[PDB]
């Protein structure tokens, strides 16, 4: 039981790491989308 528990705990560490990586990528590309939509407004104005 202890062996399997320790394996599960280190795999917990790994899963937390990957979760945080997912959060990082998601939020960075969210910022990218904000910027791009601002640019969209600007260039639609410019084409008009």
């Amino acid at each position: 039981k202890k062996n399997r528990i320790a394996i599960l705990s280190q795999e917990l560490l790994a899963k937390k790491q990957r979760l945080n990586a997912a959060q990082k990528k998601y939020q960075a590309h969210q910022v990218k989308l904000k910027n791009e939509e601002i640019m969209a407004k600007q260039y639609e104005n410019d084409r008009s």
Partner: protein, 49 residues
């Protein structure tokens, strides 16, 4: 672990959604820019005439 992976998959799915939105709006703006530039060039040769 189960709940951590739940958050993982939610984040990944929303991220792929947003990447597709990125490609969408990028193409939108590229075509908009090309249309504007062509209109301006029409204007310019109109001005030479």
């Amino acid at each position: 672990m189960n709940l951590i992976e739940t958050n993982i998959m939610k984040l990944h799915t929303e991220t792929k959604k947003l990447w597709e939105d990125l490609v969408h709006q990028k193409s939108e703006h590229t075509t908009i820019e090309k249309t504007a530039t062509n209109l301006n060039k029409q204007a310019n040769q109109i001005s030479i005439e």
